[PDB]
């Protein structure tokens, strides 16, 4: 009755990742879903939360109920304290904002942008997300990350940074010297495609 029929339009499908194709929000969530599976059961893993980039954008919605729903999904009482927020500038760029709420009275926020000459729009979008999460955007730290030499792999740098920082939380180096420094990462598009294919 509700089954898909061959005479109608096919169900939607996320397109595959190519060698230099721009990553979509669906690709990012599939990667972080698979990462959460790989980390499940490990010590400290339950302190982490990987946000969907569409929920992050919902924080700035002009609709009251949609805005409050996003605030509950990312800062509610049941959300882990270390949240990774992908920041999207549509048709343009990806960056990463990390919010550490383990101390309710001393929240720390970190922003990673792999673009060489930075766009003022990108930090502004990161500042709006922090503002709608109840933070002072002026206290967000702009942190070092490897600079991309191409015009396509900004999504790769975001996912690799989440990958690396998550494992530093697992082994306990996130809180010590250079624990939040991502200068030496080397994103691997082939590895990213493999993890999306084996998920």
């Amino acid at each position: 009755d509700n089954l898909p029929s061959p005479q109608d339009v096919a169900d939607p499908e996320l397109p595959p990742v190519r060698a230099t194709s721009w990553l979509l929000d669906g690709h990012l969530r599939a990667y972080t879903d698979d990462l959460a599976r790989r980390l499940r059961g490990e010590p400290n893993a339950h302190l982490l939360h990987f946000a969907d980039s569409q929920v992050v954008t919902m924080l700035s919605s002009a609709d009251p109920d949609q805005q409050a729903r996003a605030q509950r999904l990312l800062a509610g009482d049941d959300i882990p304290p270390i949240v990774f927020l992908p920041i999207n500038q549509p048709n343009a760029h990806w960056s990463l904002l990390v919010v550490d709420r383990r101390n309710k009275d001393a929240v720390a926020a970190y922003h990673y942008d792999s673009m060489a000459q930075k766009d003022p729009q990108q930090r502004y979008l990161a500042d709006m997300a922090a503002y709608h999460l109840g933070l002072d955007y002026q206290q967000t730290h702009e942190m070092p990350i490897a600079i991309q030499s191409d015009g396509y792999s900004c999504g790769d740098h975001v996912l690799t940074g989440i990958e690396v920082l998550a494992h530093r939380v697992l082994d306990g180096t996130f809180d010590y010297a250079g624990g939040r420094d991502l200068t030496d990462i080397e994103p691997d598009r082939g590895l990213i495609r493999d993890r999306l294919a084996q998920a």
């Binding site: 509700n2 169900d11 979509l24 929000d25 669906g26 569409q54 919605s61 729903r69 999904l73 343009a92």
Partner: protein, 77 residues
């Protein structure tokens, strides 16, 4: 047997749907996409942070009367 749901797009306007709890989501996804004249491969449907698929039903998703779904344009960069 029926359930009333809302879909809220980035225009802020809410669209009210009434389907059976056994009806798969593709019926709602198709009807919404025809109003906006964009295909289903350009819009993501999320329910409390969960991405919806064409084959899932409200009962499988544990939806309740008056629940709301967010329809968001795809993001690239």
């Amino acid at each position: 047997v029926h359930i009333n749901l809302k879909v809220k797009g980035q225009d802020g306007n809410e669209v009210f749907f009434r389907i059976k709890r056994s009806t798969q989501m593709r019926k709602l996804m198709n009807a919404y996409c025809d109003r906006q004249s964009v295909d289903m491969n350009s819009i993501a449907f999320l329910f409390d942070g969960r991405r919806l698929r064409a084959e899932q039903t409200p009962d499988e998703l544990e939806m309740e009367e008056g629940d709301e779904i967010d329809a968001m344009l795809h993001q690239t960069g």
